[PDB]
Design an enzyme around this catalytic site. Structure first.
Site, PDB file in Angstrom:
ATOM      1  N   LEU F  38       0.843  -1.186   0.000  1.00 39.66           N
ATOM      2  CA  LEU F  38       0.000   0.000   0.000  1.00 39.66           C
ATOM      3  C   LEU F  38       0.881   1.240   0.000  1.00 39.66           C
ATOM      4  O   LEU F  38       2.043   1.191   0.411  1.00 39.66           O
ATOM      5  CB  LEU F  38      -0.938   0.028   1.212  1.00 39.66           C
ATOM      6  N   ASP F  39       0.326   2.354  -0.472  1.00 40.13           N
ATOM      7  CA  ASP F  39       1.057   3.612  -0.484  1.00 40.13           C
ATOM      8  C   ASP F  39       0.746   4.394   0.793  1.00 40.13           C
ATOM      9  O   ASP F  39       0.074   3.900   1.701  1.00 40.13           O
ATOM     10  CB  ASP F  39       0.749   4.394  -1.764  1.00 40.13           C
ATOM     11  N   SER F  40       1.235   5.633   0.874  1.00 38.49           N
ATOM     12  CA  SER F  40       1.074   6.423   2.092  1.00 38.49           C
ATOM     13  C   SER F  40      -0.393   6.719   2.379  1.00 38.49           C
ATOM     14  O   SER F  40      -0.839   6.654   3.534  1.00 38.49           O
ATOM     15  CB  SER F  40       1.862   7.725   1.969  1.00 38.49           C
TER      16      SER F  40
END
Lengths: 111, 49, 48, 47, 53, 82, 48, 48
Positions: F38-40
């Site tokens: 997942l990204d930020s």
């Protein structure tokens, strides 16, 4: 090659904080739960629309403009957890501080 | 009763009975007073009629 | 009826408050005690 | 993305469909039934 | 002057014509090392003591 | 106070109830960017969901610091209002 | 004045019951769907 | 008033699951004043 990484990490942290605050105030504006999903998806699309920008300078200007826009449109009275700083229950019945001593026989004629 | 993973206990019998009965008394009082003083409030006829 | 309409069947108030400066200002004005508290407090009490 | 966020929050909010929290307007007026039945009895008893 | 102003963030290699971007990037990665890395940026240098007409 | 096992289970439920997350590869010691990908912004969405479930408010700095399951469980277990 | 004293004290007491039961929530944005779980308190609020 | 009633009781749930589990209606000494105030809010206006 560390100063650039540090500045990029700081910009990413600013973006993350801005997104967190924007999501919270989006939930505040859309009081009803079922109205929050569409607003959240729209705001996530808005954030990811300007993703993958190369120059850090224009990234910083984008961050500043987004912060100003958020400050303009933020909720006047955002929801705060009652015990959280600024809530209705904040410092209501706090636990006694540690390291406090009560002294007996303070003032006497003779010691 | 539980539906996905959250169970919610039924409200107490005396709570439900008291609330329902007091609201029923309110609605019956409103209906009885409306029947008694309906035309008077609505201007259909004076109280001395 | 107006309360039922606004609270339960409405999907435009948040967008108006977020994209209309006048609507946002009106919402803030009616939420924050007609701005009366802030104006009176700020001016008189800060001057004193 | 946006649809992913919407799906995430919808999935996280699946407990709000509890049978004791789905519809609350059936409990909006609790006494109307008994009050109307009693008022019908009273109206019948008048005549 | 070189060490304080020719810092990598302010440095761009522009190639035009019969060049390949991958080859240029590989050569730049291989060659342009040990360049100065100063935290000061041209934006803050302009912000300090700006120009007034 | 709320048990650490229940904290772990609820955090794992929050993480597993995600679109871009494979529910099989969710463990109390996974990292959002590394393991389950997942990204930020997904991280901060997960943190917001954890807040909403656990009835607690995190300062923005610590919310950014929460970037993995192990951190989430550690913070929620250390918080006395969980 | 007397009538307002009566029903306003009723409203305040019922709202205090709701707040006390909801762990001192006090905010309506996080208070929906309590008609089923608060039969007597909701009845009192409706009457008032 | 109707907006407050809807938001607090009839709007679908918006509160956190933590508060929903542990919600209990008003006990006896919080309900006895409520019953008396409800009777007053019913009949004081008509009697007086």
């Amino acid at each position: 090659t560390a100063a650039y990484l540090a500045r990029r990490a700081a910009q990413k942290e600013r973006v993350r904080i801005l997104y967190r605050r924007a999501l919270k105030d989006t939930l505040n504006w859309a009081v009803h739960r079922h109205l929050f999903y569409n607003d959240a998806e729209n705001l996530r699309d808005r954030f990811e629309e300007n993703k993958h920008v190369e120059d850090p300078d224009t990234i910083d200007r984008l961050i500043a403009d987004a912060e100003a826009s958020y400050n303009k449109w933020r909720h006047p009275d955002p929801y705060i957890v009652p015990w959280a700083p600024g809530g209705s229950k904040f410092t209501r019945n706090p636990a006694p501080p540690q390291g406090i001593e009560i002294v007996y026989d303070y003032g006497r004629e003779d010691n | 009763t539980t539906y996905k993973g959250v169970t919610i206990h039924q409200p107490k019998r005396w709570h439900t009975i008291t609330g329902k009965g007091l609201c029923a008394v309110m609605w019956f009082w409103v209906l009885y007073r409306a029947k008694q003083d309906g035309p008077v409030v609505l201007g259909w006829r004076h109280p001395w009629e | 009826s107006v309360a039922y309409n606004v609270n339960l069947v409405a999907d435009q108030f948040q967008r108006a408050f977020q994209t209309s400066t006048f609507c946002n200002r009106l919402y803030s004005f009616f939420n924050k005690r007609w701005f009366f508290d802030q104006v009176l407090n700020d001016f008189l009490v800060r001057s004193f | 993305s946006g649809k992913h966020t919407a799906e995430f929050f919808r999935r996280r909010d699946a407990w709000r469909k509890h049978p004791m929290l789905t519809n609350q307007f059936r409990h909006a007026t609790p006494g109307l039934g008994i009050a109307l039945v009693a008022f019908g009895f009273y109206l019948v008893g008048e005549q | 002057y070189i060490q304080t102003h020719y810092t990598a963030p302010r440095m761009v290699i522009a190639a035009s014509g019969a060049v390949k971007h991958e080859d240029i990037v590989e050569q730049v990665k291989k060659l342009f090392t040990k360049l100065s890395t100063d935290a000061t940026t041209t934006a803050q240098l302009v912000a300090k003591e700006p120009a007034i007409f | 106070h709320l048990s650490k096992e229940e904290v772990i289970q609820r955090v794992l439920a929050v993480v597993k109830d995600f679109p871009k997350v494979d529910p099989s590869k969710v463990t109390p010691d996974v990292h959002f960017q590394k393991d389950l990908g997942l990204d930020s912004l997904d991280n901060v969405e997960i943190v917001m969901a954890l807040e909403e479930e656990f009835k607690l408010e995190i300062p923005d700095k610590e919310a950014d610091k929460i970037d993995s399951c192990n951190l989430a469980i550690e913070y929620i277990a250390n918080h006395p209002m969980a | 004045l007397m009538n307002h004293a009566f029903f306003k004290a009723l409203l305040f007491l019922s709202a205090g019951s709701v707040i006390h039961a909801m762990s001192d929530e006090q905010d309506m944005r996080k208070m929906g769907g309590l008609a089923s779980s608060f039969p007597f308190t909701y009845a009192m609020m409706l009457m008032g | 008033s109707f907006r407050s009633l809807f938001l607090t009781f009839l709007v679908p749930t918006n509160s956190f699951g933590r508060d929903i589990l542990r919600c209990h209606d008003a006990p006896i000494p919080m309900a006895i004043p409520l019953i008396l105030l409800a009777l007053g809010s019913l009949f004081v206006g008509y009697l007086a």
